Symmetry: D4
Subunit: 150 residues, 8 copies
């Protein structure tokens, strides 16, 4: 992609419902050229899809957690555990990181009870887990994963 | 909102470009009723906006980090630091969490050099920071923040 | 319950032996109305019971401890361990907390010897325990669990 | 005190509303002798008072926390900080312990918001605090501080 | 024992070769009375014995270490491990402490090689050991265990 | 010194009151030769002195502690702090160690109260102290610092 | 560079004194072509120089250490500290790493005394240092930094 | 060796390609005497070999790591693990250190992918590993292992 594609993506990351006319006017290119470039970005896997940004608070997702999970060494415990963590309802992010050399899991639940029932109790029953540490999010200063171009 | 709004949102969180006809058929309600419900969800702040999901790898965002930042106590150091962290280019998530009682910052950069220049060097110069710990993400098992309804 | 029940409880949390006449005068309601409200709070499980507050020092409870206990993951180790900890003589508080994701156990003993015999040696023999950390309380700045209404 | 006083206290720690007749029958001593022994235990400071045990859940005290607080060394920072912590609404327990050589603070709040407003923000503004770590209680396996005689 | 015994012990903790005449003059009691009191302190186990204080440096004991050793929970692992640690040549102190809830082992060796051969390799082969942390002493500011009366 | 001096010291480290006749018989050398060798070891600083080993329990030294103390960097804070720690009544051992790169302080007191008054409160008032961690000794498996030759 | 340069470097990383004839025979290229390629690798900064590998043990470098050093945040403390650490005699490696977000310093000394005098005492006097942790190397399983091509 | 050998080594540690004439002139000794001394240092194992110093950046070795690895206790797990770590492609340094009482492994790779494939995945599959912590090097302030004489 080129500089023009970047200007298009910079707009799309914020508003996926802008009309072709508007964007075409903002970037200074023919609407048909814009339509083509967007179609290609989708075909090339640059634009993976379009999602509605739903306010978690509107769904009463008040119990937000970030949990570190250490896995047992040997066999294929690490890889298998990552997959088990990602299948848990409420879990939207699972990363393996260096430093602590473990998994960081991001999840959202409506209440403590739901978190315990759907997440913690589940993880507590996995034998290949060595340790876990749940950080309760008490303030979201910023959460805009959609912004990839600053 | 009711059960019907939830079925609508469950679809919109995945595909914001579905036509009214398609969704109306999937949920079994008049297209005009659907259009109304969606307009209300937007007006009530439930649907905050629509974004294009861009593949970070397509933008060469290869240096992904999760950093813990501890703040000095006193005055208004904590609140002010959170805001400073959120203003850094590349930073998309800033949370204050219990447990470690500190900030967790999520950011993405193209390279180590960019991370050092735009993020680390910046944070290193803030006097009210007490400690920092950067976890380098080496594998993203899952990252679907758009999914709020499982 | 209403604001009046709260005024009643605020008094009862401090002095359970106050006469109906006194409280009735303090809150400005008929003694019979007070007697009724108290009877209902007991029936509804709001007031669980009335206890005498005994000075631990009078019983020579000089060895006060707060111990963190980590459990092995898998099976039903966590739940079962919590119950084993709560059955130990001298233990009055057992909590499972996030952050360290473990149990915090509050206990009181007359001496180091009693603590070792009744608590530590017991816990040391439980195989599903992974780690423990005992914090010796050397000063109680405040301990008024009875105060629920400030 | 003697063995008889201990039998009396063992009953009073559980039920402060038992009648003299009942206890006298249970322990096998004259009601007047019982009344005398109880009056003396109160006069000698053994029995500090009588409280109603109120169910925290009935007051919607759903956000339960245990926080470790480290103080700056020098001057009289430690002693002064302990007193500041004990004056915070919602705080019922403040202990200084060895091991971590810091304060452990027990508190209860109705919600995260109340905890942040009344406790965390307050503590965050105290300059002599070096570090804090809040453990969110997600399960109370046992909490019977009134039991001093097992 | 009384105040006089304490004055005697205060001298003996520093110089076990002082003559009865000298001590008798220093404390103001008959030499025969002194001889009697000392004989009784030995008989009662107060004075356990008399040792020559040898300068470790004179024996080339240059590799001084303080090692923390954590034991596996269950069976009788803890007690048995303490005894195994105390039987190691070079080990003069073994303590079980709260806080870290583990063993602290004090030892002295002539060289790194001797430490590795006699201590570390030995401990590394004990399966019930969970973790160890050796602190290398690089400066002895004070080491006077013989002083019990200040 | 030679092998003979080592055999002499091996005896003296255990019993400083053995008669010359006894030792001479045990090691197979003339009593006058023994007397000479011992006098030289004392003159050369090998034998620093002779102490009576007093049972700490006989002096009611029931509160035994091992405390780690971290010092502020800069100026001459480290060296000066070590000296301040060594001057505290009850402190018999002060070491600076690598690993934690801090001081390890060994002390003995009769009670918690004495420990707090004489040691902890004192250390709490030293501004150049960064952190402290007191490990309460609950069992002395072995404590024979006098043994330098195994 | 190409595959041929890599074969040349693979030999040079192990033996810088091999003759052109030998290498030319081993890789199958004209000696003059080899001489040219080597001259270019030096000119392009690929080959930085040629060093004699001296056995540290032959120089009595028996005290080997790896120290973590944390710096104060603010101003230009971090960058300046790294440079100060690199100027210390005996220090051959200084790295800033993520995870602990601090400096890792590799050094070698003949004795503990030299380490304390040349390194530790020096670092202890730098005010912008927050913490340090020295790991004493007791066994070098492998140390071949010269091997860049496996 | 003597002072003259040290002057020779001080030059050779920096430039192994200096001619005998040059060094002979710099140190003031006959070229034949120099040739002899160098030959002896090689024969005695002082000079282990001569290597070309290759710039890691020229080989695209951009992912530099320092990993701590803790081993399971018992059998011969420790010794065997050290050897397994040293056999991993990319690993140039393996040390066992006190303090953390574990292994520190230094390695270099071209990319994150290579590090994961060749190092991390390999180590993750070793059952006797208890924990690992990888520190990503983001800046090499100094790396001159060849310098043994300052
Ligand atoms: N430029 C526009 O916005 C629309 C007309 C133009 N010819 C096109 O096809 O794009
Ligand atoms: N039902 C549909 O999808 C469209 C027609 C319907 N009458 C409406 O207005 O929605
Ligand atoms: N008010 C009182 O305290 C007692 C009398 C009142 N009529 C009642 O029954 O409560
Ligand atoms: N024993 C009782 O319970 C009451 C009567 C008895 N004489 C008394 O004064 O206690
Ligand atoms: N007082 C002394 O020192 C010796 C003489 C004294 N009569 C005694 O037996 O002790
Ligand atoms: N050998 C002994 O124990 C004493 C007698 C011997 N001649 C000596 O002077 O030592
Ligand atoms: N090939 C060799 O090793 C030397 C001769 C060849 N012609 C050259 O110049 O390299
Ligand atoms: N001194 C030199 O550099 C060479 C000549 C001298 N005679 C020698 O053999 O070393
Ligand atoms: Mg999106
Ligand atoms: Mg009560
Ligand atoms: Mg002694
Ligand atoms: Mg070299």
């Amino acid at each position: 992609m080129d500089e023009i594609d970047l200007r298009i993506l910079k707009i799309l990351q914020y508003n996926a419902k802008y009309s072709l006319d508007e964007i075409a006017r903002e970037i200074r290119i023919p609407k048909s050229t814009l339509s083509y470039r967007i179609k290609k970005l989708e075909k090339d896997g640059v634009i993976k899809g379009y999602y509605a940004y739903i306010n978690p608070a509107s769904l009463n997702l008040d119990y937000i957690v970030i949990t570190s999970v250490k896995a047992k060494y040997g066999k294929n415990y690490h890889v298998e555990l990552g997959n088990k963590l990602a299948q848990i309802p409420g879990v939207w992010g699972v990363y393996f990181v260096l430093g602590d050399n473990d998994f960081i899991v991001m999840a959202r639940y409506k209440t403590r009870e739901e978190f315990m029932e759907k997440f913690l109790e589940r993880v507590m029953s996995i034998p290949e887990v060595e340790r876990t540490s749940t950080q309760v999010v008490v303030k979201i200063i910023k959460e805009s994963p959609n912004i990839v171009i600053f």
